[PDB]
Design a binder for this molecule. Structure first.
Ligand SMILES: CCc1cn(Cc2ccc(F)c(C(=O)N3CCN(CC)[C@H](CCO)C3)c2)c(=O)[nH]c1=O
Length: 349
């Protein structure tokens, strides 16, 4: 006897699909049989991070021989992969390391989803109502003719980046987000409050909606995070939407809009994993892109600057090396974040 609005019922059914998570983890080659997702613990995942840090130590020492082979073998033993007939590959590039961190990140958010969906049943409540209660996060659908829908649609469409031309986006539905406790934790005192994008894999939304956006743990290798262990946002919808990792066959995903208390940004042209130690008073890191929304179109929504598009050149160019195409924003404390809107997005490849 579900008491939820049907749109919220659809949302819960989408993000609590444990079998869809199983599929995604198999595409990342995690062995869903040898280590079932229902048999996932924080300790298993912590040991995996510690193995990745040992791998990082080998990479920074230029040790691509025995020491790296066994450090990788230890990671693959603690986090079982199914490579079928092939031999597990060595991890020595930053991207190869990053791919394994992303795998561990999905496991951590799936672990939260498993505890939630397997949590104590009722028989008095519809299952979706139980799962929704166990989120401790209000999800309120907004009317498609509403003003909020119009401005979010404009933000989504007007900040789609030109270099992301292989797909367009259609807003299927829109929910207001109010996670228990975030208002009382939020740094209302800080300036430069912006409504910014965050995209994530479908496996992670139960954890994100339940536990909020959070920092990478200390046991994670620092070089996996280009601007340090923070929470990353964009002002271009498509740059965040790329981190949904939607596909031709799985072209439905979610995008998150959050009020971000940026304060004073430490501006940077290129990546630095140690950027948090460079704050020294400032409250956020801004990686500078060559294209960004301009102030002329900025609007305001419940106290936050919505950086509506179109985007234009910023004259930013890094002579030292590589230049970011688009901005990214990083805060290092979740009390600078308040989740606001959840977009159900169709990817039209
Ligand atoms: C620029 C927009 C953008 C970037 N990136 C990539 C990225 C890179 C490094 C990062 F540290 C994080 C990040 O924020 N993390 C790390 C993982 N998790 C650790 C517990 C958390 C997840 C939220 O709880 C916090 C994200 C996305 O994935 N989506 C996006 O929209």
């Amino acid at each position: 006897e579900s008491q939820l609005d049907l749109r919220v019922q659809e949302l819960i059914k989408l993000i609590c699909n444990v079998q869809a998570m199983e599929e995604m983890m198999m595409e990342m080659k995690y062995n869903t049989k040898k280590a079932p997702l229902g048999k996932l613990t924080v300790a298993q995942i912590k040991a995996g991070y510690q193995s990745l840090k040992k791998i990082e130590d080998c990479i920074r020492a230029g040790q691509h021989g025995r020491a790296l082979m066994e450090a990788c073998n230890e990671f693959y033993t603690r986090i079982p992969h199914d490579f079928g007939l092939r031999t597990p590959p060595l991890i020595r590039t930053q991207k190869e390391l990053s791919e394994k961190i992303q795998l561990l990140e999905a496991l951590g958010d799936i672990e939260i989803a498993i505890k939630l969906v397997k949590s104590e049943r009722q028989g008095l409540e519809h299952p979706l109502d139980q799962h929704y209660r166990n989120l401790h996060c209000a999800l309120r659908p907004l009317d498609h003719e509403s003003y909020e829908f119009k401005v979010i649609s404009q933000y989504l469409q007007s900040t789609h980046a030109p270099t992301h031309s292989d797909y367009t986006m259609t807003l299927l539905d829109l929910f207001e987000v109010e996670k228990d406790g975030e208002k009382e934790a939020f740094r209302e005192d800080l300036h430069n409050r912006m409504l910014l994008w965050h995209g994530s894999r479908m496996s992670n939304w139960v954890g994100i909606l339940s536990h909020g956006l959070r920092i990478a743990p200390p046991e994670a290798p620092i070089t996996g995070y280009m601007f340090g262990k923070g929470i990353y946002f964009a002002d271009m919808s498509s740059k965040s939407a790329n981190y949904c990792f939607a596909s031709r066959l799985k072209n439905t995903g979610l995008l998150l809009l959050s009020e971000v208390a940026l304060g004073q940004c430490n501006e940077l042209l290129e990546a630095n994993p140690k950027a948090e130690g460079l704050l020294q008073g400032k409250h956020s890191t801004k990686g500078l892109g060559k294209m960004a929304p301009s102030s002329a179109h900025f609007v305001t929504l419940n106290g936050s600057t919505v950086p509506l598009g179109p985007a234009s050149d910023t004259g930013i160019l890094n002579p030292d090396g590589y230049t970011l195409n688009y901005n990214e924003y990083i805060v290092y404390n979740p009390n600078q974040v308040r989740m606001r809107y959840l977009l159900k997005v169709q990817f039209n490849f």
